[PDB]
Amino acid sequence: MPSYLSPGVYVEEVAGVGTSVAAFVGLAPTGPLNEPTLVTNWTQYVAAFGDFTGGYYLAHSVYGFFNNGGSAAYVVRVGGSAEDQAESAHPGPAQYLGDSSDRTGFGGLEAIDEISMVAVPDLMAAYQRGAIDLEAVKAVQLGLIAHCELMGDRVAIIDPPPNQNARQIRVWRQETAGYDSKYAALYYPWIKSFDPATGQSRLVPPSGHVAGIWARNDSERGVHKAPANEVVRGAVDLELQITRGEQDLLNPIGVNCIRSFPGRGIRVWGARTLSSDPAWRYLNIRRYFNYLEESILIGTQWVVFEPNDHNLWARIRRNVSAFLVNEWRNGALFGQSPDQAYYVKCDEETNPPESVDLGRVVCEIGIAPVK
């Protein structure tokens, strides 16, 4: 049962852009100071960061929101290009908070709202150069996932290791670095693309445009739909075609694939959560819930509860139902009537007589699961 009560439960310590905004961690050719994470469009991005001259992955993964569906995204700089240490698992693509300094890293985003996804394009940029041992990578991916779990309303984009066969991913997934969490997902094959600064080819991780798809998908249909069949616009080719005999082994363990389809182009096909929990296996379901939570929590935003009183309960019940009945009227929910499609409860049994400080307990039923 995800919080159905509050932004924080034990202490009331607390006293838009849409789902398309995401954040990326990596190095810039130039860039602004690295701490003030900024959110913007390609047009201004390049003016501050640089025209791919540093050889960094942010220079390319940024297009995920510009050569595909998008608007703006947050960028954490970490540091810039050397003229004409950051490759360690500690700084940069790390939980590099700086002891409450919100320094470049998963920690620097803790103070920032309105982020639905977080990617780290330069973690593997120096995989070979910086000798990023497996754990050096694993530790960062764990830090990213933990960040997302703690914020509670955004998810992690996890990169596969740089170059390995299907057997070897079955291996890290089951034997050396499985993550098992409702807050993360991974795609396997690497994508060939070009780099106009110097020539026809570069290899990039299945991120960037892959995330651009989520923004596209949300505009086409409610977040309920999965982008289980969508074009990776901007892709040139794939390193490997993964056949049915391989899909049979990878989909059951949560590895999403991108394939070149005979007459349809390069498309995203897999749509599973990198999680062991049957409830959260499907990505579109995990997303539907984050979607509803962001909008309902912003909507019913009252600060400092006055008197625990039925009159507030009545205002709340009425507002939640008014919000949800449209999901039913529209095609998002299942059921012949609101009666079955959704459930709202807020009365003295969720808000018992002790009435200690915060009340406002609202119980809700989605389709089968309960909040």
Among 45-53, 111-119, 223-231, 329-337, which window interacts with other proteins (CB under 8 A)? 329-337
Give the residue with the Cβ less far from other proteins, 335 or 352: 335
Give the residue with the Cβ less far from other proteins, 264 or 329: 329
Q: Compute φ and ψ for 355, nearest 5 degrees.
A: 50, 45
β-strands 255-256, 73-76 pairing: unpaired
| Cα angle: 262, vertex 265, 266; to 5 degrees | 115
| Residue in 7, 318, 355, 367 binding other proteins, rule: CB under 8 A | 318
Q: How far is the CB of 329 from other proteins (least distance, A)?
A: 6
| Residue in 14, 47, 203, 322 binding other proteins, rule: CB under 8 A | 322
| Residue in 252, 265, 331, 335 binding other proteins, rule: CB under 8 A | 331
41: helix, strand or coil: coil
17 scored as a contact of other proteins (CB under 8 A): no
Q: How far is the CB of 328 from other proteins (least distance, A)?
A: 8
11 scored as a contact of other proteins (CB under 8 A): no
Task: List the one residue out of 156, 151, 154, 153 whose CA is nearest residue 110.
Answer: 151
315 scored as a contact of other proteins (CB under 8 A): yes
221 scored as a contact of other proteins (CB under 8 A): no
Q: Which residues contact 42 (CB under 8 A, 6 or more apart)?
A: 62, 63, 65, 66
225 scored as a contact of other proteins (CB under 8 A): no
Q: Which residues contact 57 (CB under 8 A, 6 or more apart)?
A: 26, 121, 122, 125, 204, 205
264 scored as a contact of other proteins (CB under 8 A): no
C-alpha span between 320 and 362 (Å, rounded)? 9
The count of chain residues that interact with other proteins, using the rule CB under 8 A, is: 10
Cα–Cα distance list, 158 to 36, 211, 220, 267 (Å) = 24, 11, 25, 19
314 scored as a contact of other proteins (CB under 8 A): yes
Give the residue with the Cβ less far from other proteins, 14 or 314: 314
Q: Which residues contact 221 (CB under 8 A, 6 or more apart)?
A: none
310 scored as a contact of other proteins (CB under 8 A): yes
329 scored as a contact of other proteins (CB under 8 A): yes
330 scored as a contact of other proteins (CB under 8 A): yes
Tokens 């961690």 correspond to what residue?
25
**Interface residue list for other proteins (CB under 8 A):** 310-311, 314-315, 318-319, 322, 329-331
